[PDB]
Structure formats: structure tokens, C-alpha cells
Amino acid sequence: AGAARSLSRFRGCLAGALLGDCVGSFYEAVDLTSVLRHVQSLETEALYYTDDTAMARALVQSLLAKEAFDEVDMAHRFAQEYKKDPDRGYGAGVVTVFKKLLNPKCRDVFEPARAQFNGKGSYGNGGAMRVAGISLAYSSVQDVQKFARLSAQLTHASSLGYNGAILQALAVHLALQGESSSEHFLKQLLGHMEDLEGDAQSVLDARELGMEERPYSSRLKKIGELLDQASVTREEVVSELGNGIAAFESVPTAIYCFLRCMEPDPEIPSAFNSLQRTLIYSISLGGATDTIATMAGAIAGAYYGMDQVPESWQQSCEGYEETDILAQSLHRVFQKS
Ligand SMILES: Nc1ncnc2c1ncn2[C@@H]1O[C@H](COP(=O)(O)OP(=O)(O)OC[C@H]2O[C@H](O)[C@H](O)[C@@H]2O)[C@@H](O)[C@H]1O
Ligand SMILES: [Mg+2]
């Protein structure tokens, strides 16, 4: 709500991400009718957050402590946050990275991520699940891309992983700018991803995994088709975009959820506002619901602002007040209000 990159959008962004994580986590690894029954419960801090929020908080606290990106600080905050509470539902592979980073002999904090999965790097969505803070801290598209990539590379060295983090950060960046058509929003994202996926390293990373050339671009083109298609079913969405833990099977899906739900949906009750129905729709897709909902929620919260964050939902979430203070701090320190 209000001006581009306003305090309301900053607070709404991080609150939306927390709601998606906490509420989404109920359904991780799902039918439209019975989701609507579950949010009835939310009509305090009983919903625990997961690794999505834990790593987002460490990322933001690194940015605030150094008033800049500092790979050693952030890498060590990721590792110490894991050491402090390892039971948040971290990916099975990424824990190896944290353990390597906990060794004081580790002098290049990017190298543990590069050894993952036979030296090809992770393409999991962990780099994207946490990246919204980057777009709160950085105004420029150039800086958003630069530090979404770097923050992700601390754990996700595959371009399939960090290009999902960039896409998700670009989406939040665009949402923080305010009102747009769904087609203009999508078109801008398509342009950026077409540019990034023209890079030789990206092409090789994708051909090695047997995927199409420009996987994110192809999925963003499918979003545009889906947005023009009649009677789109959840199975159709899952089949074309995915609902899994790969970044390329969850980040475009999160974006689709946001774009679709910019308009009312007769199949979800009018009493839910735009942020609420975006989260409800995301969870109804099943699969990796907490990360898809957390990412859709970050985009929607930045676009719709704090006035659409419902207190009853927010106050069910573990850490919601700290999440809010961190949002306000980013706005003070980086948006320099
Ligand atoms: N190159 C690869 N080859 C094969 N499998 C892979 C590869 N990369 C990832 N995977 C699979 O992807 C998995 C995750 O990769 P990880 O890097 O451990 O962690 P994350 O931070 O991305 O978290 C992944 C999500 O899952 C949880 O719900 C979290 O909350 C996240 O939402 C691996 O275990 C592999 O099965
Ligand atoms: Mg999680």
C-alpha cells in the first residue's frame, strides 16, 4: 500500500512470507474445500516457522549488522542459526554445507556449496525461499540480481538453484513498486530471465541435467499461457509448473499464484482479501506447500501491503513481532526511510 518501497510494503512482504511458511507448513509434502476449513482455526504463536523463515531471518540480520552484503558474516549466521536450532526442517543436503561452514578452517565460504551433489550444486529452492530481504535492502535491478545470486550461492551453487533465487527476488522487487497489470509484471520477469539464461554457464548447467534451454524462461512463458487459459485446474498448474522442492518447480508456481490471485476467484469466498486468497490458493496446490506459500506470500505482501495482513493470522505465527521489527529496520537502514 502507498508509495513504492513504503514501510507498509516492507512489513507486508516479510509478514506475508511468515504466514506462508507457518500456515503452509501444516500441509508440507491437499484439496481446495478442506483448506478453507483449516484457516477457520485462525479466525498465539502456535504455528512454528520452518527453515524458510529461520534462514530469511539470518539473511536479514546479516544485512542489518553489516549494512551491506558480507559473505562471511552471512554464511556464519546461516551456520550458527542451524547449530542453534537444527530441527526446523532443513533440506537433507544443505546441512552438509552448514557443517562445513562451522569448521573454523573453512576459509572460502562459497566452496562447500559447490561440492554438493557431485560438484554440480543444489538446485533446491532454499536459495529462493529466504531471498525476499535482498529486495528490501536493494533498490536497483542490478543490485537485486547481484546479491540474490550471491546470497543463494552460499548454499546453492547450481544456476538452476540461484537463478530461482534471482527470479523470486526480482518478483518481490517488482511487487514493491506497486500497481501493475499481471501481463506487465510477467513480461518484465521474462525479460530478465531470458537475459540470465542466455549465459553459457546457465545453458550448460541445464543441458547437463537434461532440461530445456532456458528453463525459467520456458516456465514463465507457460504462466502467460495459463493466465489466458479457460478453467485451469490444480493438476494442470502442477503439471506445467510443478509443486516440488526444486527451485524451478516452485518459484514460477509461486509467481503464478500471485498473478492468478490478483483477481477475485469465485471459487474462494469473498470474505478473504487478496493476500489471504493468494495463500489459500498456493496451499491448495499441495506438494512443497510451505516454500511455495512463503514465496507467493512475500510477493503478495509486498504488493498489497501491511493493511492486508490479518491480525488473527499474523498473531498465530511464531516470531511475527520480530519479523515485523526486522522489516522496519530494513526500511530504516536501507530504504533510509
Ligand atoms: N543437483 C541435485 N541433484 C539431485 N537432487 C537434488 C539436487 N539439488 C537438490 N536436490 C534435491 O533437493 C533437496 C533439497 O536441496 P537442499 O540443497 O538439501 O536444501 P534446500 O535448502 O534447497 O531445501 C529444499 C526444500 O526442502 C525442504 O522442505 C526445505 O525447507 C526446502 O523448502 C535435496 O535433499 C535433494 O533431494
Ligand atoms: Mg520449510
Numbering used by the authors: 14 to 42, 46 to 59, 70 to 363
Q: Which of the paper's sentences describe this entry?
A:
ADP-ribosyl-acceptor hydrolase 3 (ARH3) cleaves PAR and mono(ADP-ribosyl)ation at serine following DNA damage. In contrast, ARH3 has a unique ARH fold and a di-Mg2+-containing catalytic center and can efficiently reverse not only PARylation but also mono(ADP-ribosyl)ation (MARylation) at serine; ARH3 can also cleave O-acetyl-ADPR and α-NAD+ in a Mg2+-dependent manner releasing free ADPR. While coordination of two magnesium ions (MgA and MgB) significantly enhances its catalytic efficiency, calcium binding suppresses its function. In the active site of ARH3, acidic residues, including Asp77, Asp78, Asp314, and Asp316, maintain the integrity of the bimetallic center and render the ideal alignment of the substrate for catalysis.
Similarly, on the other side of the active site, Asp314 interacts with 3″-OH of the terminal ribose and MgB. Asp314 seems to contribute to the integrity of MgB, given that the substitution of Asp314 with glutamate eliminates MgB from the active site. In the structure of ARH3D314A, similar to ARH3D314E, MgB is missing. Unlike ARH3D77A, the orientation of ADPR in ARH3D314A is nearly identical to that in ARH3WT, and critical residues for the formation of the binuclear metal center occupy nearly identical positions. The geometry of MgA is also maintained in an octahedral shape as seen in ARH3WT. Consistent with these findings, ARH3D314A shows a 44-fold decrease in ADPR-binding affinity compared with ARH3WT. Notably, this reduced ADPR-binding affinity mimics the metal-free state of ARH3, further supporting the hypothesis that MgB is critical for substrate binding in ARH3.
